[PDB]
Structure formats: structure tokens, C-alpha cells
């Protein structure tokens, strides 16, 4: 008698949880139909307030109004620069937001920079101390700061001949530092609209207060911060004034990369916007082992491998020239069809890296 | 090398490419006959890792192109 039972009550059972089902899907149905009936509200941005219930508000890009907070909101945290949202029927004030994100800067902050390690990067013993120094120390450690009276440096700047990782070592700061990280190619940030770009950097500025500790990181600086078309001078000047901006307290800090330091406007290079310069020169001779020995590193070769015979060779080699010759050790190996790599490898890639350096016409190079 | 909007582009081209976790699986072909004229910037060993030189053809390359 209890199959019957066991099957009319597990019928039930699921007749009765696919109900709860269908009342879920029922439940989203009357939610989402109650959100249609919702209508969304003007966004804008705050001025000066007249009275105690007459505010002046800057609706986004459009035109400024004189309206008035709700009857509930706070009236002391309205000050000139808040977000607030206004209905369109009466425009006046509900729901003060706090910020825009600009999302832009979201994709600037939440960029994959690598694993890189102070490990994987080798050559620049003095320069990573130095940016450390700079940028690391200031944001973990400020109570030395603070108390012993050393105003920390806003930014730093680094110049140097391609391929010598500046990049890499931003990378590598991002990566370790447990913080919140700006990154934004500077020919980006240049926008066909009229004076966007400087609201862009603005809005990055003030997410990079709003977000502290936060570290913005500028590649190819000279983008915008070459010497004096319009529109980059007008958001250089932005940029002056806005990193001119950092109080003492704020933990943000700022690296500029450049290839060419020449071309930038001195008006960066003065001191109380960018005091302490960095340059990584072209790796030295244990640089250059230092850096092969890394580059090698994983990858899988027999024998003895003779760094010191190729760091003999490979003169004027970057660090992107020392990857280049171990990739082509490896596609030296895989032409092969050698499941390893040997020191013949290596050779030949030293070699034909060599001869495609005879290309690399570099143009000398001069600091700022 | 080094107007100021197409310094720019490729300035872009070149953090697009080299900067900031590239790769994944997209792989750049690059043509000009002017080489000479781009060297520091584009030409760095991390951003273009192979440069093939197309010589001008031989007796027998010649031969197998008529
Ligand atoms: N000292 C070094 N140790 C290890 N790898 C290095 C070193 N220097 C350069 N490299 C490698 O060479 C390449 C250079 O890339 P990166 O963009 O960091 O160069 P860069 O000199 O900072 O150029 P740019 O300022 O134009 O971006 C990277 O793949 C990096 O891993
Ligand atoms: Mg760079």
C-alpha cells in the first residue's frame, strides 16, 4: 500500500515546490511590472544655495536651475558639488547621490595589471627603492610622514629608452601594493568633445580622493604634457591645476611614463607638482644577466646555459630585447621540434635579435 | 618618429599593444617600406618581437615569380 502513498505524496511534494516556483517567477513578474510603472530622475550636480530650501543646480551637461530640496533631505550636506537627482515634473531635489564613478574610471580602477612581482623585475635595484621610497612608503607608512613633517611627494615621473620597463614596474606596484590603482593611457584620455577631457581627469582626480588609498599611473605622459592642439593645452592646464589640488592628507600618488622626456612642458617639471624624477637607463651588464636569468627562467632547457657569454654579446639590449632573445630560443626549439632548449638556441637568438636591433635606428635620447 | 593627433594614435596603438596585460590571443602584422622613419617607437623588440626583411628577390626567386 505505501507505493501508491509514496507516489501521490511525491507528487504533491512537487506539484507544491514547483508552486513555489511558479510564485517566484509570478512575484518577479508583479516586481518587474512595478518597476515599469517607475520613472527615473535628472541627475546634476549642485551650486550655491540661496535660502534654506532654494538651491541652485547644474542638470548635467544642460542648463542650470533654481529649485528646491524635497521636504525631508538634509540641508547641511547640500554644499556646491554634491549629486543629486531631481524629478522632471517640479525638478526639485530627492535622493542625493553621491558621486559619479565616471565609468571610464571604473575601467581605469578594475584593469588586470598582472602578478607581477619586485622579483620578476630585475636591473633596477635603485629605481624600485626609489619609486618604494616615493609612492609605497608614503600610502602604507604615513605616521613617519605625518609626525617627523615631510610633506610626501605628489608623483613621480619616469623616462627612460623604450623597452627598459617602466611600464613593467608600474605593473609590478600595481600588482603588490593591496590598494586601489588608476591606470590610463594618456591618448585615451583626449576626447573630440568640447572640454571633456578636462572633466575626464577631473572626475579621475576626484575618484582617486574619493577612493584612497589610490594610486593613478600615467603611460605616455607626453601625450598631454608635451610643450605648448587646443584642447591638450586646455587639459594640461586642468591637470596642473587639479594635481596642484592634492592637500597634504590625501593618500594619492601619481607616476607619469614617457619615452621622449624632452617633448614634456617644463611646467610639470618644476617642483611642487613633480619633484622627483626616475631614469631607467639601458639595463647594465648584471642588469642584463639578472634580467635573462628571469626571462629564462621557466622555460625548459638542457645543459648549462652560459648567461654571461650572451650578456657579453647582447650589447645595448633592453629587457624587451632579452625577452625577444629567449622567445626565439624558443621558436628556434619548436622549429626543431626540440621538446627542450639548448645553448645553440640561445646563440642564434642573440644573434637575430642583434640584427634586428641594426633596425632599431634609436635616436639618442636626452633626460628632461 | 617624434601634427600632434596622429602621434597620438599611435601612441595608443602602442599601450594597445604592448602595455598593461596584452596579448590573450590576438596576434599584429605590420607592412611599411620606410622603417627608417619609425624607429624608437613602434619598433621595440616587446611590441613588434619578429622583423621579417623581404629582400629584394632572387635569380631563382625571380624566376618562381614569373
Ligand atoms: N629590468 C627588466 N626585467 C625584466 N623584464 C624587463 C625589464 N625591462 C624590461 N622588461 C620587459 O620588457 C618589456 C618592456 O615593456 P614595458 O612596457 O614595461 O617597457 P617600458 O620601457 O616601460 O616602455 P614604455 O614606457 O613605452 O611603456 C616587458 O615585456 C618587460 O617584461
Ligand atoms: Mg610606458
Request: glycine share 6%; charged share 30%.
Amino acid at each position: 500500500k505505501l507505493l501508491e502513498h509514496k507516489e501521490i505524496d511525491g507528487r504533491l511534494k512537487e506539484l507544491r515546490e514547483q508552486l513555489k516556483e511558479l510564485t517566484k517567477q509570478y512575484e518577479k513578474s508583479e516586481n518587474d511590472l512595478k518597476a515599469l510603472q517607475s520613472v527615473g530622475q535628472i541627475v546634476g550636480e549642485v551650486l550655491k544655495q540661496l535660502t534654506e530650501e532654494k538651491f541652485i543646480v547644474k542638470a548635467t551637461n544642460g542648463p542650470r536651475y533654481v529649485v528646491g530640496c524635497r521636504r525631508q533631505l538634509d540641508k547641511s550636506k547640500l554644499k556646491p558639488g554634491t549629486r543629486v537627482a531631481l524629478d522632471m515634473t517640479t525638478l526639485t531635489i530627492m535622493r542625493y547621490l553621491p558621486r559619479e564613478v565616471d565609468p571610464l574610471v571604473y575601467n581605469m580602477s578594475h584593469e588586470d595589471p598582472g602578478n607581477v612581482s619586485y622579483s620578476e623585475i630585475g636591473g633596477l635595484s635603485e629605481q624600485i627603492r626609489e619609486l618604494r621610497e616615493v609612492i609605497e612608503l608614503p600610502l602604507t607608512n604615513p605616521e613617519l610622514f605625518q609626525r617627523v613633517g615631510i610633506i610626501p611627494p605628489k608623483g613621480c615621473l619616469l623616462y627612460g629608452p623604450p623597452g627598459t620597463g617602466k611600464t613593467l614596474l608600474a605593473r609590478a606596484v600595481a600588482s603588490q601594493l593591496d590598494c586601489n590603482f588608476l591606470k590610463v593611457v594618456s591618448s585615451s584620455i583626449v576626447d573630440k568633445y568640447i572640454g571633456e577631457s578636462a572633466r575626464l581627469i577631473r572626475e579621475m582626480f576626484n575618484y582617486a580622493r574619493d577612493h584612497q588609498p589610490c594610486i593613478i599611473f600615467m603611460d605616455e605622459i607626453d601625450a598631454i604634457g608635451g610643450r605648448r592642439d587646443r584642447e591638450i593645452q586646455r587639459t594640461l592646464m586642468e591637470l596642473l591645476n587639479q594635481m596642484d589640488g592634492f592637500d597634504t592628507l590625501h593618500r594619492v600618488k601619481m607616476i607619469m611614463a614617457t619615452n621622449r622626456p624632452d617633448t614634456l612642458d617644463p611646467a610639470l617639471l618644476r617642483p611642487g607638482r613633480l619633484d622627483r624624477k626616475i631614469h631607467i637607463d639601458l639595463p647594465n651588464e648584471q642588469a642584463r644577466l639578472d634580467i635573462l636569468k628571469i626571462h629564462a627562467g621557466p622555460i625548459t632547457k638542457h645543459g648549462e646555459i652560459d648567461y654571461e657569454a650572451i650578456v657579453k654579446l647582447s650589447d645595448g639590449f633592453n629587457g624587451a630585447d632579452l625577452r625577444n632573445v629567449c622567445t626565439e630560443a624558443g621558436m628556434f626549439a619548436i622549429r626543431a621540434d626540440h621538446d627542450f632548449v639548448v645553448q645553440e638556441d640561445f646563440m642564434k637568438a642573440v644573434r637575430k635579435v642583434a640584427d634586428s636591433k641594426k633596425l632599431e635606428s634609436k635616436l639618442d635620447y636626452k633626460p628632461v | 618618429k617624434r601634427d600632434r593627433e596622429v602621434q597620438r594614435t599611435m601612441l595608443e596603438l602602442l599601450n594597445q599593444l604592448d602595455g598593461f596585460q596584452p596579448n590573450t590571443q590576438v596576434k599584429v602584422i605590420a607592412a611599411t617600406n620606410r622603417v627608417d622613419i619609425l624607429d624608437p617607437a613602434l619598433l621595440r623588440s616587446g611590441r613588434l618581437d619578429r622583423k621579417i626583411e623581404f629582400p629584394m628577390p632572387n635569380e631563382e626567386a625571380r624566376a618562381r615569380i614569373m
